C-alpha cells in the first residue's frame, strides 16, 4: 500500500473491519433483502 500510494499520490486512513469476517452472501432474518456480509459489505455499502 505504501509503495502504491507513493506511486499514485494518495492520502488515506486504515481501519480494521467491524466483525472479523471476510465476506459472503446471506439473507438476513426478519427481512427479504439478501445482504453482503462483513468486509465485502463494508465496501459495497459505502464505508470504504
Amino acid at each position: 500500500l505504501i509503495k502504491l500510494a507513493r506511486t499514485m499520490q494518495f492520502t488515506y486512513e486504515v481501519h480494521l473491519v467491524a466483525d472479523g469476517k471476510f465476506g459472503t452472501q446471506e439473507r438476513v432474518q426478519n427481512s427479504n433483502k439478501k445482504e453482503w456480509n462483513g468486509m465485502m459489505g463494508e465496501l459495497l455499502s459505502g464505508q470504504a
Binding site: 439473507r27 427479504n32 433483502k33 439478501k34
Partner: protein, 372 residues
C-alpha cells in the same frame, strides 16, 4: 348517529335491504352504527353528484359505501374527486367502482376494494416457483402501469436464493403495426416455455393471433396474465389459447351482503377507535361542498385510524394509496371448454390448488416414473 349510507345503483340487490340488519352485531365497539339505505336505476355523472350530496346535505352523512356494476371506471374517478372536494371517507366496493386507480389525489379519502399490480406479480411468481422454474420472458406494451410491473418482478428475481433465470423483456410499439412482425420474429426468439405478458384486451387478441402466425400458441408454451386481460367477463373471445392462466379477484363466491357488512364494520370500528380513544368530533358537513369546506378543512383527518382496522378475525387494513393488504385472490384458467374454471385460493402468500401435479392439457411425452 354516525351517518353511513349505502348506494346500490343499476344493481339487483334488493334483498340486501335485509342484509343491513345483520349489522346488529356491532355492539363490540358500542358506537352508534346509524345506517340507512338508498338505491337508483341507471346512472350518469350528474345523477351521482346530485343524489349523493343531496343525501349528505339532508341527514348528516358521516361516510358512505358505494356498489354498482357495468364496469365504467369513470365512476371510480368521479367518486374520488368528490371525496377530495368534501373530505369525507367513502368506500367504493363492487365491480363497478372496484377498479384500482393508480395515482389517486392527495387530499382524497377513497380506499378502494381490490388488489394492486405488484401483488398480482407476486402471486404469479409464487405459482411459477411451484412448478415452472424460470420467468422466461415478458412481452408488454407501454400501457400505463408498465414500468412498475417489470420493476416489481425484477426486484423479486434478484433478491432470492433460487434459480430465476429471466431471459429477456421486450416491449413493442403497438401504435405502429409494421415492426411488430420483426419483434414477433424476436418473439419466436423467446425459445422458452413460460412467457408472461401485460396489456389490454384488444392488444391481447392481436398478440395472440400474431403468436398464432408464428406458432408460439402451441403446447410447447404456457401463458400468464394479470387480472385485467379479459378477466372482467365470462365471454372469452377467439384467438385465446387454452390452458391460459390468470389471477383475478374472487367475484364468484364472495357475498355482496358480506361485503356490505364488512364495509359497515370498517367505518364503525374506525369511528370508535377515533372517538373513544380521543373523544374528538368527526364533525358533519353543513352541506355538500358548496362553500363551507373551509370550516371542515381545519379538522384533523381520521384517515390514520381508518388505515389499520381489523374485525371478525380478518386483517382489513389498507395501504396509503387505497388498496387491501392481505386481499382474497383466486387463480383461474381457460380449459378446453372455453370457460373460466376456478382452481386455487390464496391468502398470506400461501397456495392451495388442484392436486400437486399440473393438468397439462392436450393439443406424446412426459412419462410418469415411480421409485422408492
Amino acid at each position: 348517529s354516525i351517518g353511513i349510507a349505502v348506494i346500490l345503483v343499476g344493481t339487483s340487490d334488493e334483498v340486501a335491504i335485509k342484509d343491513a340488519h345483520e349489522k346488529d352485531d356491532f355492539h363490540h365497539l358500542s358506537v352508534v352504527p346509524r345506517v340507512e339505505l338508498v338505491a337508483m336505476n341507471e346512472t350518469d355523472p350528474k345523477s351521482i353528484i346530485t343524489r349523493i350530496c343531496d343525501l349528505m346535505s339532508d341527514r348528516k352523512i358521516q361516510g358512505v359505501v358505494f356498489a354498482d356494476d357495468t364496469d365504467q371506471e369513470a365512476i371510480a374517478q368521479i367518486l374520488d374527486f368528490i371525496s377530495a372536494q368534501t373530505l369525507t371517507p367513502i368506500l367504493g366496493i363492487h365491480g363497478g367502482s372496484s377498479m384500482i386507480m393508480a395515482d389517486k389525489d392527495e387530499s382524497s379519502m377513497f380506499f378502494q376494494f381490490g388488489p394492486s399490480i405488484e401483488q398480482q406479480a407476486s402471486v404469479m411468481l409464487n405459482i411459477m416457483e411451484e412448478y415452472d422454474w424460470y420467468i422466461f420472458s415478458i412481452v408488454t406494451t407501454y400501457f400505463p402501469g408498465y414500468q412498475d410491473f417489470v420493476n416489481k418482478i425484477r426486484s423479486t428475481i434478484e433478491n432470492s436464493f433460487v434459480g430465476w433465470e429471466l431471459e429477456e423483456v421486450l416491449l413493442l410499439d403497438m401504435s405502429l403495426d409494421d415492426g411488430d412482425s420483426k419483434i414477433q420474429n424476436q418473439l419466436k426468439k423467446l425459445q422458452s416455455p413460460i412467457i408472461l405478458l401485460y396489456c389490454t384486451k384488444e392488444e391481447a387478441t392481436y398478440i395472440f393471433e400474431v403468436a398464432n402466425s408464428v406458432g408460439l400458441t402451441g403446447y410447447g408454451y404456457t401463458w400468464i396474465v394479470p387480472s385485467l386481460v379479459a378477466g372482467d367477463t365470462d365471454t372469452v373471445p377467439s384467438e385465446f389459447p387454452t390452458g391460459l392462466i390468470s389471477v383475478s379477484y374472487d367475484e364468484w363466491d364472495y357475498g355482496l351482503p358480506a361485503r356490505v357488512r364488512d364495509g359497515i364494520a370498517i367505518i364503525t370500528t374506525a369511528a370508535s377507535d377515533m372517538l373513544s380513544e380521543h373523544s374528538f368530533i368527526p364533525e358533519p358537513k353543513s352541506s355538500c361542498y358548496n362553500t363551507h369546506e373551509k370550516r371542515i378543512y381545519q379538522s384533523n383527518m381520521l384517515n390514520r385510524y381508518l388505515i389499520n382496522v381489523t374485525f371478525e378475525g380478518r386483517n382489513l387494513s389498507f395501504s396509503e394509496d387505497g388498496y387491501q393488504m392481505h386481499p382474497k385472490l383466486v387463480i383461474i384458467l381457460l380449459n378446453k371448454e372455453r370457460k373460466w374454471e376456478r382452481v386455487g385460493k390464496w391468502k398470506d402468500k400461501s397456495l392451495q390448488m388442484k392436486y400437486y401435479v399440473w393438468p397439462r392439457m392436450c393439443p406424446d411425452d412426459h412419462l410418469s416414473i415411480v421409485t422408492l
